[PDB]
Amino acid sequence: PQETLNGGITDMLTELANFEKNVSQAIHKYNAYRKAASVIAKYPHKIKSGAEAKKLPGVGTKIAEKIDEFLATGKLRKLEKIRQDDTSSSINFLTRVSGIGPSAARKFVDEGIKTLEDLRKNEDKLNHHQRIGLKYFGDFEKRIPREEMLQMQDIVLNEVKKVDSEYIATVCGSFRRGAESSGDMDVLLTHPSFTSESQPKLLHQVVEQLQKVHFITDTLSKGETKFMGVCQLPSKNDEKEYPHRRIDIRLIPKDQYYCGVLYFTGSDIFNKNMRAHALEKGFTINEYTIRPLGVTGVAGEPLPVDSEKDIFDYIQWKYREPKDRSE
DNA sequence: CCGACGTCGCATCAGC
DNA sequence: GCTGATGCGA
DNA sequence: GTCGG
Numbered sequence: 486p487q488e489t490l491n492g493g494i495t496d497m498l499t500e501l502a503n504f505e506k507n508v509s510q511a512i513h514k515y516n517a518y519r520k521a522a523s524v525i526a527k528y529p530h531k532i533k534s535g536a537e538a539k540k541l542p543g544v545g546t547k548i549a550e551k552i553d554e555f556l557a558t559g560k561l562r563k564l565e566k567i568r569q570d571d572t573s574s575s576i577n578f579l580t581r582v583s584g585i586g587p588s589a590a591r592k593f594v595d596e597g598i599k600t601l602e603d604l605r606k607n608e609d610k611l612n613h614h615q616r617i618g619l620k621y622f623g624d625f626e627k628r629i630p631r632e633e634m635l636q637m638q639d640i641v642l643n644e645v646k647k648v649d650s651e652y653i654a655t656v657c658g659s660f661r662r663g664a665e666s667s668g669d670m671d672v673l674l675t676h677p678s679f680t681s682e683s684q685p686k687l688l689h690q691v692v693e694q695l696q697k698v699h700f701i702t703d704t705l706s707k708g709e710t711k712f713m714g715v716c717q718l719p720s721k722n723d724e725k726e727y728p729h730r731r732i733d734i735r736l737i738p739k740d741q742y743y744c745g746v747l748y749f750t751g752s753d754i755f756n757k758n759m760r761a762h763a764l765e766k767g768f769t770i771n772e773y774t775i776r777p778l779g780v781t782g783v784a785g786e787p788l789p790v791d792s793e794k795d796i797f798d799y800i801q802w803k804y805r806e807p808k809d810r811s812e
Numbered sequence: 813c814c815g816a817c818g819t820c821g822c823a824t825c826a827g828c
Numbered sequence: 829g830c831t832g833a834t835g836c837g838a
Numbered sequence: 839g840t841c842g843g
């Protein structure tokens with residue numbers, strides 16, 4: 486639809502959602518509000534009453550009550566108050582720093598640290614991830630135009646193949662779904678000599694190289710299968726320098742790679758459909774495998790998969806191309 | 813009335 | 829020292 | 839906060 490149909494309402498519900506997660510630490514109230522925000526967002530009519538909204542799945546009595554107050558007064562008293570509150574609105578803000586969750590934000594504000602200025606005055610009190618997230622607070626909230634994504638994919642695939650030509654690397658996320666912009670780069674890595682029944686340097690070796698050509702600039706976390714870090718394109722000539730970008734790289738066993746590809750390609754909305762269409766025909770899908778339920782509910786063994794399509798040939802669905810996968 | 817409501821890899825904490 | 833729990837992000 | 843066993 487259009488936001489301006491029920492935008493004020495969905496904004497309200499999203500704002501309320503963030504305070505539940507970050508300040509109240511009620512994650513199920515956080516999800517409740519987003520679920521409601523979602524079903525209202527795709528609701529193709531202007532909501533004239535709370536009761537009308539209550540008809541939608543995910544909207545119950547309390548939110549209906551809230552919509553009436555917003556409709557009648559243009560605002561929500563509880564929201565206005567908590568927005569004005571110095572403790573709560575500070576805690577909520579600090580969580581925008583990657584590495585700082587609801588718990589870390591709490592401790593910081595408890596002992597006086599409320600702002601980015603405060604965080605900078607207190608580097609010693611931050612862990613490694615949190616300094617990077619701080620250092621790139623601005624950049625991390627910027628989005629990535631597809632042109633830069635392609636430029637990034639260019640570098641990644643080139644270096645990956647350069648280290649070992651038998652690597653297979655796929656950029657997933659919304660990029661693979663042909664999206665016009667992207668929040669980050671999510672790379673999926675595999676190699677013939679890494680299977681479910683299977684070197685720890687397979688992941689390491691790729692990271693090392695991307696560092697050697699100065700693509701990767703910082704490391705948030707790094708293990709034997711999951712890398713999370715920061716990358717940056719080279720600056721062209723005179724022109725200003727690019728924003729630092731978030732990039733993940735995951736190593737997956739060759740046989741689990743396509744359940745991996747599908748799952749991390751998204752979308753969320755779609756992945757639940759494909760999850761829950763699938764249940765119908767007696768199959769469950771994780772990020773690793775597809776399991777056949779099962780005379781019980783007993784997931785039996787996972788069934789072999791060496792293509793994305795192979796999967797659609799276990800639950801009898803029409804292979805869907807990546808750009809028609811937002812539902 | 814009251815429990816379910818996402819899962820998993822890594823960094824760091826709590827505790828022995 | 830190590831194991832297990834908790835915080836965090838995606 | 840919402841939904842349902």
Ligand SMILES: Nc1ccn([C@H]2C[C@H](O)[C@@H](COP(=O)(O)NP(=O)(O)OP(=O)(O)O)O2)c(=O)n1
Nearest residue numbers: 658659666667668669748749750751752753838
């Ligand atoms: N909270 C979250 C968010 C994402 N994910 C998983 C499922 C998603 O398909 C995948 C990508 O997450 P994502 O980066 O937030 N979304 P996506 O890359 O598709 O869109 P943009 O970040 O490009 O805007 O990671 C998750 O498991 N838990």
Ligand SMILES: [Mg+2]
Nearest residue numbers: 658659669671
């Ligand atoms: Mg992404």
Ligand code: NA
Nearest residue numbers: 539540541542
């Ligand atoms: Na409803």
Ligand code: NA
Nearest residue numbers: 580582583585
């Ligand atoms: Na955060």
